[PDB]
Amino acid sequence: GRNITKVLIANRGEIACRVMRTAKKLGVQTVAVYSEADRNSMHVDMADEAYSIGPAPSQQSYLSMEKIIQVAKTSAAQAIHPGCGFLSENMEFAELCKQEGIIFIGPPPSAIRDMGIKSTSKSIMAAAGVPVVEGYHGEDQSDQCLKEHARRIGYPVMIRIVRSEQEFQEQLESARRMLIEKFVDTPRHVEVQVFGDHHGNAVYLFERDCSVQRRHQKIIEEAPAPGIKSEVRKKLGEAAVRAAKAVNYVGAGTVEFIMDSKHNFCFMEMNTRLQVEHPVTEMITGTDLVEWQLRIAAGEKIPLSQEEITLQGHAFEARIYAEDPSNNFMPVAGPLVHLSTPRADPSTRIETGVRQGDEVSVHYDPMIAKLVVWAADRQAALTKLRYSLRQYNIVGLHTNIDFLLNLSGHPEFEAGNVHTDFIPQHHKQLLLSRKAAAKESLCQAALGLILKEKAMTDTFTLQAHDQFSPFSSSSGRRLNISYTRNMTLKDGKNNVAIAVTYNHDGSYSMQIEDKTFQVLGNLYSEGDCTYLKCSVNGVASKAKLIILENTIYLFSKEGSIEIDIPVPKYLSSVSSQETQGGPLAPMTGTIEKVFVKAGDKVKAGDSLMVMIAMKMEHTIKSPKDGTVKKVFYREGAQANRHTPLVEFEEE
Amino acid sequence: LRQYNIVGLHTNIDFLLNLSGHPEFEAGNVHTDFIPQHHKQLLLSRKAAAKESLCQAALGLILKEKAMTDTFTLQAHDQFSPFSSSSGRR
Amino acid sequence: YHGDSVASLGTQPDLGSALYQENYKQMKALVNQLHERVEHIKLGGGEKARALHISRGKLLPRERIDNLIDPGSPFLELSQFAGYQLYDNEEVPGGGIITGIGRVSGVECMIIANDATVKGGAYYPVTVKKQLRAQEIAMQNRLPCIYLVDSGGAYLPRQADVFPDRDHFGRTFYNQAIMSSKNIAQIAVVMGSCTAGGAYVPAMADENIIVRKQGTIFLAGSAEDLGGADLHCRKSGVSDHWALDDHHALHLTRKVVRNLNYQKKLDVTIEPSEEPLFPADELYGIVGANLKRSFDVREVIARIVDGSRFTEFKAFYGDTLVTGFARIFGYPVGIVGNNGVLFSESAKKGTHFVQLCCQRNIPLLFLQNITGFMVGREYEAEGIAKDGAKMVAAVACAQVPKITLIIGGSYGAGNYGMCGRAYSPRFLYIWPNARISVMGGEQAANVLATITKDQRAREGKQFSSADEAALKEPIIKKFEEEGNPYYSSARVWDDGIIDPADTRLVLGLSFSAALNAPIEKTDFGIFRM
Known part of the structure; x- marks a missing residue:
């Protein structure tokens, strides 16, 4: 029952960082909690104080x-923000906070239970009259x-779709080989946001x-929902507002309704989870809901009246996941060697918990x-979303960005x-196989390897005493003749042979199959990302170039291409098998x-034999x-020295 | 006010x-008359520091020594010698 | 251009394998035994002696070193086990002297401090040998010598083993005079009493520091009036600097070193350092404590060299010996390690490799795990002795810095070919599982079991199998006891027993110190083709 000047965030990852950002802009001191794995996490480094709560399993x-x-008491935090998931919908935890005199930043226990x-x-x-x-x-x-x-429904x-009473028995027995609901093409899920103050006032x-x-x-998530009439929008929200006032709702909330078609909607569930789809609503209404939640939890009234609240433009939210679409959206865990995102701006907001x-x-x-x-209309916002998604790049693990x-x-x-059913109905269209790369793209990749080698030559030159030597140039120039390099790169399963002639002007002429391309390019660095500016046959382009392992990655606004560099057999270690045909006896x-x-x-x-020589044990x-x-x-x-011990089948 | 730091002369910031x-x-x-009336509470004497603060001060001194060692290492030909580490190993 | 991708050594051991589990358990016990014994040696004379030492206002010898060296810098102590059970009823922790290499004012120096808590700082025969070894290391590497003098003189009951001979106490002053003539600074800090020969140490030093009341110098033994800082500082003139206490003297010493006008210069090419690709503690499972089992020395190499990168030389010729080029902490090194019995091909391969390293001025590292030379009528007919001698002769004449690490057995002439103590390696270290002797314990037992079986078969009185172990058991016990690492290290045969997990760090510190001296050109003798 006090003004909040310090707040413990009982969560991790992106939600923890979002709650902390509102607190920093408000001057409220921030306490993180962390597990052994999240010791170096972004929300730990972001907090003013951070405390270990034990091992990696969330149950512990x-x-x-x-x-x-215990951490809230030790840090003297006056309030706990639970975020979303974990303890945010735990009635026992909320009551325990109230018992210990700590402000739970969320709804009253009665609402959570009801x-x-x-x-x-x-x-x-x-009772609220919300259609059910x-x-x-x-x-x-x-x-x-x-x-x-x-019949009553x-x-x-x-159950099996049942369109009439005559088909009910056959469909029931088919389904059994139960619960009944109402079937109809009802796949539009429309949700509303309602905030209520301790005073009982509520806005939608x-x-x-x-x-x-998926x-x-x-x-x-798209706000406002497409096709909803201005008059329907007012009625749908007002029903949510009346329902919230009746249940004495306090804090942020989401009320869900189901519309099959023709603006026919019915209640499904109400969530106190502070769903993470909140950002789209904030952009359209120009409000910070985390700030509103902190103010309301302390005891302040709702900041804006319904008349003051206004709808501007359209916003889209897309959640990047490490799930791999090819293995049915299987979750993947791996190092993020390269992560980059669209540039932040008032229109474009990125919410992330990883670096x-x-x-x-x-x-x-x-x-x-x-x-x-965010944008003025749905189509323009969609165009911006695609423009931004192309600018989101990840290397080192599988992602849903392509899907x-x-x-x-x-x-x-x-x-x-x-x-x-959008994903099942259009499943074939949404998942598409890689196409063979164009020769132009292959030329760009070849230029990238050549320019990277030039940079490596430059690095050695800086260390060297003879900095200005003509040999340190990467001109590839011979006396009276021109150097042509035969280089092979692999696109998919296809080996491509590119012949690159190093021209005197500094350009490279590359022939792939029967087509000759004139390529000129340079490497420039913006931020921490190297970019390749290149012209092929006079067409000019810019792409982000990352060369990791044996793969060249070129990311452009149009598309991303990955090309492979063949690995020599001697390094492959297949050679280690070739070095000797068979194992021989070490000694007699x-x-x-x-x-x-x-x-x-x-x-x-795998040990094949054990041999003792001069009382000395050797295992083959x-x-x-x-x-x-x-x-x-x-x-x-008794086996003589260097005599074959085992014969292996030819492969 | 806590973020404001002034060293070299006394200031009214803590007041x-x-x-x-x-x-x-x-x-x-x-x-x-607010300042005269509440003079006893507004003017505050110094209190003994916690052991955690002393640990942080010692850590800062050690890290300053490590930084000095790195600064010296920068100008040496033997840049990668293990002796240049601040491990204090035996 | 250094962007080429290369292959790397090493393989992942089978942690689940029973052999690995047993080897790790045995080696771990040896390391734990080594650690706790050093802890006891760390205490020196004992609580009563330490309490008395502090009661006089003096710092403990190891606290002096901590304050002398640069803050947080590592200290490479040498011969920690000197005098361990060496004398029947007298305990002499560390020989009564602490020696090691540390950084003072950014300069690598050799520090020699008497431990006054041990027998009042008296010089036992091992104490002289330990100090002489330290001086030899300092001279060969051009390391300035700092003497923290607090001594009680020679141990009279054992004078014959301290005073007279060439490698006896007199040699200490000879070494000081020689190093001074070579511009290797000699700094003495009198932090206590020094009598008879002890008084010569401050007198023979280039610069000298004495504490106000604790320090005393006199050829013939109140002590303060006869010696003392004031008399020498102001009247005798033996003292160059006057110090209030131990802390002040150590501060003065750091200033003296800073004025040496010395800057280290490297003769070798340098590349950025990289950690090995495999954990070092896996060496416990790989090596174990059973010398009869064999392991691939390449596994040891893969866990100490930068990036586990190794260029093997003559891989398929004389495979019982492994030679190649690598880098440790950026320094180039040529590694020679045993992988079986030495053969004629192995000796030839080693001789060729040593010439290569000497030509390019590349430091050499030897990994001794020997089991002897090939024995056979044909091998002798082909001059195995002639081939083995080729390697003894190349190794001796090599002028590049040489460091030897005994990771296994060291027997017979195999020791000499692999740069034993007799061949002046800059440093010599041994793992806790090592064994060294003229021959393996079993061979000496079996050889005798031939001589006396013959003795009584040829003489005609029968000699039975039970008579055999009344012959063999005492021999095996003797060789096991005298080949133990602690027996070898108690006497100064090596520079210390080191934990295998610390091998990379110790080698890095040792090679760094050895590079303080310029590398000379190597002159070889006649190669008996």
Whole structure:
């Protein structure tokens, strides 16, 4: 019950950084909590104080109510911000904070409990007059009872779609080989934002659309939701406002409604999670909701009246994930060797919890970041989103960025005809195979390797005493003749041979197959990213160039191409097998042990035989992973020095 | 005010920090005799430091020595000798 | 251009393998044993002696070194185990003297401090040998010598082993005079009593510092009136600087070194340092403590060289010996390590390699794990002795800095060919599992079991199998006891027993110190072709 000057953030990752940013702009001191893995995390370095809450598993760290309360007491934090997930929807934790005199920055326990129970929330919501969806949740399965409930809900219903009473029995038996709801093409999910003060006043921010869903996880959020009439927008929000006042709602909140078509909507659930799709609403209404939440939690009234709240433009939110679309959106954990994003501006807001050089971990959700763009109309905002997504680049792990670009490109999305089967219906179109690269792109990659070598020559020159030597030039010039370099690069599974002639002017003439290209270029650095400015046959382009391992990565506004540099066999270590055909006896000695049968599959480092020579034990090891063709010696045999011990099948 | 740092002469900054944190000033109960009336609380004596502060001071001294070692190493031909480390290893 | 990609040595060991588990457990116990024994030696004379030492206002010998060297700089102590169980009933921790290499005012110096808490700082025979070894190291590497003098004179009961001979106490002053003539600074800090020969140390030094009341100098032994800082500082003139206390004297010493007008210059090419690609503690499992089992020396190399990069020379010829080029902390090094019994090809391969390193002025590192030379009628007919001698002769004449590390057995003439103590390596270190002797314990036992089996078979009285172990068991016990690393290190045969995990750091410090002296041209003798 005090003004908040210090706040503990009982969360990690991006949400923790977002809450902290509002606190810094407000002068409120910030306390982080952290696990052993997140010791160097961005939210730890961002806080004014940070405390360890134990090991990496969240059950023993971020979900440990006792440790969070202990840190809040030890840091003298007056308030706890739970963020989203973890303890944010835990009734016990909220009551414990109230018992210990710490301000929980979130809703009252009564609201958390009432919303949590589906029956209680629906009963109050029907009392609020909010339209309700009709479903049968009864455990009883008698075919007669299920059929009577299907009639009461009215056809069509979902068990198997049931369009009429005559088909009910066949569809029920098919589904069994139950719960009944209402079926219809109802895939538009429209949600509203409501804020309520301790004084009981409430305002409605404009609605958003979360219709697009992948693996039961929302992917794209657009505010205001497309196609909603100005009059419908007022009515939908006012119903949410009346419902919030009736339940005495305090703090931020999201009320969800379901519209199949023709502006017919019904309540689904109300969430106190402070959903992370909040940024789109903030941009359209020009308000900071984290700031409003901190002020309201302290006890202040809602900052703006409903008349003051206004809707401007359109915003889109896209969440980057480390999930790999090819393995059915499988989550991936790996080092982020390169991370870059679209430049920040009032129109373009990037919300991220990770930095270049950070490592993604299986312990927590893999979402890399959330990207928000703002513009006057939906189509213009969509164009900006694609422009920004192309400017988002990640190297070192798999990402959903390509899938997002394809989805935004799809014509139906641009129309605004969004339904939650969008990904299954257009699955073939959304996932597309790589096409063969153009010869021009291959020329750019070759230039990139040549220019990188020139930079390496320059680095050595700086150390050298003879800085101005003509040899340190990268001219590749011979007396009376021109140097042509034969270089091979691999695109996909295809080896490409490029012949590069180093011209006197400093340009390079490259011939791939029967086509000759005149290429000139330079490497320039903006920020920490090297960029290649190049002209091929007079067409000029700029791309970001990263060469890591044996792969050349060129990222351009048009597209990203990855080309491979072939690895020499001697370095490949296939040569190590070639250096000797068979393992021989180290010295003349008795064979004490044989570990291989006449036909046995062995891997390099598998012991084959043990030999004692002059009372000195030697263990013979498998040179290759090849299966054993034959054995030349048995136990107790004396083997002469350098005599073949094992024969390996030719491969 | 905490971010403002002044070394080389005495200033009223710590007095302003005590004054701006006084309960009657927070309440807005101000008058021309406020400083005379609350002189005892506004002027604050020094209190013994915590052991954590002493540890931080020692760490700062050690790190300053390490920085001096790096500065010397910059000008030496033997740039990568293990002796240039500040490990204090035995 | 240094952008070429290259192959790297080393392989990931099978941590689950029983052999690795056993080897790690055995080696770990040896390292723990080594650590706790050093802790005891760290205490010197004991609590009563230490309390008395502090009661006089003097710093403890190891605290003096801590204050003398640069803040946070590593200190390479040498021969920590000198005098360990050397004398029957007398305990002499560290020999009564502490020697090592540390950085003072940014300059690498040799520090020689008497431990007054040990027998009052008296000079035992091992104490003289330890000091003489330190002086030899300083001269060969041009390291300034700092003497923290607090001594009680020679130990009379053992005078015959201290005073008379060439390598006895007299040689200490000879070394000081020679180093001074070569512009290797000699600095003496009298922080206590020095009597008889002790008084010569401050007198023979280029610059000298004495504490106000603790220090005393006199050829013939109140002590303050006879000696004392005031008498020597103001009247005798033996003192160059006058110090109030131990802290003041150490501060003065740092100033003296800063005025040496010395700057280190490197004769070798330098490249940026890189850590090895494999953990060093894996050496515990790879090597173990059983000398009968064999391991690939390349595994040891892969875990100490920069980036685990190694260019092998003559890989398929004389494979029992491994030679190649690498870098440690940026310095170039040529590595020679045993990988089996020495053969004629191995000796020839080594001789060729040593000539290459000497020609290019590349420091040499030897990794001794020997089991002997090839034994056979054919090998002798082909001049294995002639081939083995080729290597002994090349190694001896090499003028590049040489460092030897005994990671296993060291027996017979194999020791000489691999730069043993007799061949003046700049430093010599041993792992806690090493064994050294004229021959392996078993060979001496078996050889005797031939001589006396013959003795009684040829004489005609039968000599039974039980008579065999009344012959063999005492021999094996003797060689095991005298080949133990502590036995070798108690006497100064090596410069210390080092934990394998510390091998890379010790080598880096040692090579860095050895580079203070310019590398000379190598002159070889006649190569008996």
